[PDB]
Amino acid sequence: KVQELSVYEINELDRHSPKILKNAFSLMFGLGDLVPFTNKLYTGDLKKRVGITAGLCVVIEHVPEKKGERFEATYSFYFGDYGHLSVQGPYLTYEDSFLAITGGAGIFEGAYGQVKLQQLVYPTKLFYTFYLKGLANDLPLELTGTPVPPSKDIEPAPEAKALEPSGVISNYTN
Amino acid sequence: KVQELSVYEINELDRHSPKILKNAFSLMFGLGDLVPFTNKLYTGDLKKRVGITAGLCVVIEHVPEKKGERFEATYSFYFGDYGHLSVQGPYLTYEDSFLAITGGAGIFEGAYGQVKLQQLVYPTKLFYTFYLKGLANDLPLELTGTPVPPSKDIEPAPEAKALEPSGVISNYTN
Amino acid sequence: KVQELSVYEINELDRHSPKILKNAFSLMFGLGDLVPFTNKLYTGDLKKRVGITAGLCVVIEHVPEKKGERFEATYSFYFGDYGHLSVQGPYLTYEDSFLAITGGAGIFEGAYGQVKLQQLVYPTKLFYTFYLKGLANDLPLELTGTPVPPSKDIEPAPEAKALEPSGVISNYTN
Incomplete structure (x- = not known):
C-alpha cells in the first residue's frame, strides 16, 4: 500500500545554510563545489513544523542550456x-x-x-x-x-513559523 | 525475481571529471581526500549511450600492500x-x-x-x-x-559516442 | 522477521581518523565542516575483529545546550x-x-x-x-x-586486538 506524504522545506535564512565549499575553477557552480545544507521542514498542510532536512548536495555540472545546476x-x-x-x-x-x-x-x-x-x-x-x-x-x-x-506564495501557518505548540510536533527537529 | 543489468562507465574527459579535493598531507591518496566525479554510462552491449554516473568518492586510506586505494x-x-x-x-x-x-x-x-x-x-x-x-x-x-x-579495449558503438538517434535512449541523461 | 545484530566500533586512533575539514563560519563545529572517517569494527561479543566502518560525517549544527554536535x-x-x-x-x-x-x-x-x-x-x-x-x-x-x-569501559578481547586467528574473521577488513 502506498501512503503519499507531502511536506514543505523552506530556508528562512537562519541556520547558516546553504554553506558553499568552492573548488571548481569557474564563477559558476561546477564539479568540485560541495554544498552542505540544513533548512526547516513543515507539514504539507503548512500548519505544523516537523523537523529539518540535513545532508549534502554534490555539484555535478552547471547546465547553461537550462539556466540551472545539477546536484547529486x-x-x-x-x-x-x-x-x-x-x-x-x-x-x-x-x-x-x-x-x-x-x-x-x-x-x-x-x-x-x-x-x-x-x-x-x-x-x-x-x-x-x-x-x-x-x-x-x-x-x-x-x-x-x-x-x-x-x-510561489505559500507560507507556513503563522503559529508554525512562531513555533507555538499548536503549530509543531513533539520534539520538532531544529 | 532477480533481473541482471550491465552497463559500462567510461571517462571520456569531456565532463571535467573527476575533481580531486586534496586534503590529506601526502602525495598519495588518504583520508580527507574527497573526489566528486561523473563519467559516461553506456549500455552493456555498448550500442547506446544512456547517461552518466554522478556523485562522490571519499578516500578512506591508501593500501600499500595492494598498490591501490580504498574509497567509500x-x-x-x-x-x-x-x-x-x-x-x-x-x-x-x-x-x-x-x-x-x-x-x-x-x-x-x-x-x-x-x-x-x-x-x-x-x-x-x-x-x-x-x-x-x-x-x-x-x-x-x-x-x-x-x-x-x-x-581494457572496449569502446561504445559509433552511433552512441556520436549521440545519433539509434545510438541513444530517449532523453538520455547528460 | 528481524535478526538483531549488534557491533562495537572502537576508535583506537591509528587510522588518521576523524579527519576534520573545518570550513564553518564558526570556531566550534558548524555547517560546512566535514569529517570523513573510518574506525575498527568488532563482533557484539568483542571476541572478533570483523573489519571497519567507512564514510562521511557532515556537520549540521553545533548544539551548545548539549555541549555536542549534530551530524548527518x-x-x-x-x-x-x-x-x-x-x-x-x-x-x-x-x-x-x-x-x-x-x-x-x-x-x-x-x-x-x-x-x-x-x-x-x-x-x-x-x-x-x-x-x-x-x-x-x-x-x-x-x-x-x-x-x-x-x-564505557568495554574493550575487545585480546586475541582480536592482536588480530590472532581466533580473534579475527577470515580476511577481516582493514
Missing part, C-alpha cells in the same frame, strides 16, 4: 519524535525530479519508494511527494492534513 | 527518462567489489539488491552488473543486450 | 568476506539515535530496517543495535555470539 543529493528529512526519511538522487535547480527512498527509522523504518521534488522558489521553497511504501502503520494524523496546493 | 563511494546511475538507481559501498582501485543498491526511481522505483563493480582501466573504464530486485516490471528490452567482453 | 552520517560497516551494511542516519554526539539501513551486499544483500547507535565513550567506543530485516538466511554464527552489555 543524499540527505534526510526529520520529523521530530516520529523518525526520519533518507533519500538519494538528483536535485536539478531548474526542473522537478525524483529521488530514491533509501530507508527510514522510527515510524519510517523499512520505508522505500520514490519521492517527488517540486521547486517553487529558488532557493527558498520546495514541495515533495513521498510515494511511501514499507511502513508497518498508517501515518500520524498530524502529518497527513490535506496538502496546500503548491505555488 | 555514494553516487547514482542515470538512465534518462527511465530513471535512476542509487548506491553505497566500497570502490577498490585494485580489485573488484560489490556496492549495495540503496534504492531507485522511475522504472527502478522499489529497486534493491547489490552490484558488482569491475575496473577495466583505472579509472576511465568500469563495468558493473546490478542484480536488481523489486522492479514492478521487466527491464526495457533495449537495456538488456549481450554485453561486450570485459576488457 | 552516511557510512558503511565492513564484515570481511560476509560483505557490508550501509546507512544514513543522524549522529548526535550527545545522545543515542537511529539510522536508516540503506542496504547491504554479500550476505547482507536485501538488508533494510533501522539501527540504534549508542555512544559509550566520545569519540572512541560506540555500540550499534541493527534491527536487521530482509536477509536471505540466518546470520553466520561467528557474528551472533552473545553481545556484551554496553559500558
Whole structure:
C-alpha cells in the first residue's frame, strides 16, 4: 500500500545554510563545489513544523542550456519524535525530479519508494511527494492534513513559523 | 525475481571529471581526500549511450600492500527518462567489489539488491552488473543486450559516442 | 522477521581518523565542516575483529545546550568476506539515535530496517543495535555470539586486538 506524504522545506535564512565549499575553477557552480545544507521542514498542510532536512548536495555540472545546476543529493528529512526519511538522487535547480527512498527509522523504518521534488522558489521553497511504501502503520494524523496546493506564495501557518505548540510536533527537529 | 543489468562507465574527459579535493598531507591518496566525479554510462552491449554516473568518492586510506586505494563511494546511475538507481559501498582501485543498491526511481522505483563493480582501466573504464530486485516490471528490452567482453579495449558503438538517434535512449541523461 | 545484530566500533586512533575539514563560519563545529572517517569494527561479543566502518560525517549544527554536535552520517560497516551494511542516519554526539539501513551486499544483500547507535565513550567506543530485516538466511554464527552489555569501559578481547586467528574473521577488513 502506498501512503503519499507531502511536506514543505523552506530556508528562512537562519541556520547558516546553504554553506558553499568552492573548488571548481569557474564563477559558476561546477564539479568540485560541495554544498552542505540544513533548512526547516513543515507539514504539507503548512500548519505544523516537523523537523529539518540535513545532508549534502554534490555539484555535478552547471547546465547553461537550462539556466540551472545539477546536484547529486543524499540527505534526510526529520520529523521530530516520529523518525526520519533518507533519500538519494538528483536535485536539478531548474526542473522537478525524483529521488530514491533509501530507508527510514522510527515510524519510517523499512520505508522505500520514490519521492517527488517540486521547486517553487529558488532557493527558498520546495514541495515533495513521498510515494511511501514499507511502513508497518498508517501515518500520524498530524502529518497527513490535506496538502496546500503548491505555488510561489505559500507560507507556513503563522503559529508554525512562531513555533507555538499548536503549530509543531513533539520534539520538532531544529 | 532477480533481473541482471550491465552497463559500462567510461571517462571520456569531456565532463571535467573527476575533481580531486586534496586534503590529506601526502602525495598519495588518504583520508580527507574527497573526489566528486561523473563519467559516461553506456549500455552493456555498448550500442547506446544512456547517461552518466554522478556523485562522490571519499578516500578512506591508501593500501600499500595492494598498490591501490580504498574509497567509500555514494553516487547514482542515470538512465534518462527511465530513471535512476542509487548506491553505497566500497570502490577498490585494485580489485573488484560489490556496492549495495540503496534504492531507485522511475522504472527502478522499489529497486534493491547489490552490484558488482569491475575496473577495466583505472579509472576511465568500469563495468558493473546490478542484480536488481523489486522492479514492478521487466527491464526495457533495449537495456538488456549481450554485453561486450570485459576488457581494457572496449569502446561504445559509433552511433552512441556520436549521440545519433539509434545510438541513444530517449532523453538520455547528460 | 528481524535478526538483531549488534557491533562495537572502537576508535583506537591509528587510522588518521576523524579527519576534520573545518570550513564553518564558526570556531566550534558548524555547517560546512566535514569529517570523513573510518574506525575498527568488532563482533557484539568483542571476541572478533570483523573489519571497519567507512564514510562521511557532515556537520549540521553545533548544539551548545548539549555541549555536542549534530551530524548527518552516511557510512558503511565492513564484515570481511560476509560483505557490508550501509546507512544514513543522524549522529548526535550527545545522545543515542537511529539510522536508516540503506542496504547491504554479500550476505547482507536485501538488508533494510533501522539501527540504534549508542555512544559509550566520545569519540572512541560506540555500540550499534541493527534491527536487521530482509536477509536471505540466518546470520553466520561467528557474528551472533552473545553481545556484551554496553559500558564505557568495554574493550575487545585480546586475541582480536592482536588480530590472532581466533580473534579475527577470515580476511577481516582493514
